[PDB]
């Protein structure tokens, strides 16, 4: 079964646990390229009453560095916010809890904005079919495939 965080049947406790960044996408590609601040490798999500504790690592010159963030529920169901290189809000438009999680994020920094979409997997990679469903979701948000970067061959330290 699948759900959206904004849906009535969403069960947030079920996204708790291990995750891996499989693909990242953005309508401002530089943000997720090699030295971009948003090329974040998710490791785990800890679900709390009114927040999600997100654990990631970033890479630079082949060197990993850990980073944690706390995302707070906003006033709209299924939406969370977190301060990181500007102000961010995000939702989970689609997840099946056991294999994949697709997130949509809006960043606002210095009066600007951009969209980021992420495909996370319970294992370090996902099937080609789920990767295609992610490309379709990116298309629905006006993000071209050439702005979608598969990081499954670079998500481990
Ligand atoms: C559901 C938790 C993941 C939300 C998306 C975070 C994106 C970070 C920038 O890559």
Ligand 1 test: best mutation among 46, 104, 106, 118, most atoms within 8 Å of CB? 118
Please report where in the chains the tokens 């049947």 appear, as a residue: 9
Query: Is 15:32 a contact under the CB 8 Å cutoff?
Result: no
Structural domains present in the chain: 1-157 (2.40.128.20)
To what resolution in angstroms was this structure determined? 1.6
> With contact defined as beta carbons under 8 Å apart, do 121 and 99 qualify?
yes
Non-local CB neighbours of 70 within 8 Å, separated by 6+ positions: 51, 52, 53, 54, 82
Solved how?
A: X-ray
Does any ligand 1 atom lie closer than 6 A to the CB of residue 118? Answer: yes
Residues 112, 30: contact at Cβ < 8 Å? no
Q: Where are the beta strands (DSSP E) in the chain?
A: 17-18, 20-26, 41-48, 51-60, 63-73, 80-83, 87-95, 100-109, 112-121, 148-150
Asked if residue 40 has its Cβ within 6 Å of ligand 1, the reply is: yes
For strand 63-73 and strand 80-83, is the pairing parallel, antiparallel, or unpaired?
antiparallel
Residue whose Cα lies nearest atom 9 of ligand 1: it is 38
**CA–CA separation, 156 vs 119, rounded Å?**
16
Closest CA to 130 of 115, 150, 144, 116: 150
Query: 59 in ligand 1 pocket by Cβ < 6 Å?
Result: no
Closest C-alpha to 13, from 122, 134, 130, 97: 97
């Amino acid at each position: 079964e699948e759900a959206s965080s904004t849906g009535r049947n969403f069960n947030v406790e079920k996204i708790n646990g291990e995750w891996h960044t499989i693909i990242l996408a953005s309508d401002k590609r530089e943000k997720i390229e090699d030295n971009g601040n948003f090329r974040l490798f998710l490791e785990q999500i800890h679900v709390l009453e009114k927040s999600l504790v997100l654990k990631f690592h970033t890479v630079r010159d082949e060197e990993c560095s850990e980073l944690s963030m706390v995302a707070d529920k906003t006033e709209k169901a299924g939406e969370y916010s977190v301060t990181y290189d500007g102000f961010n809000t995000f939702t989970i438009p689609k997840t099946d809890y056991d294999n994949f999680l697709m997130a949509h994020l809006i960043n606002e920094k210095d009066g600007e904005t951009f969209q980021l979409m992420g495909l996370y997997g319970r294992e370090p990679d996902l099937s080609s079919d789920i990767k295609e469903r992610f490309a379709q979701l990116c298309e629905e948000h006006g993000i071209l495939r050439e702005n979608i970067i598969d990081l499954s061959n670079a998500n481990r330290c």
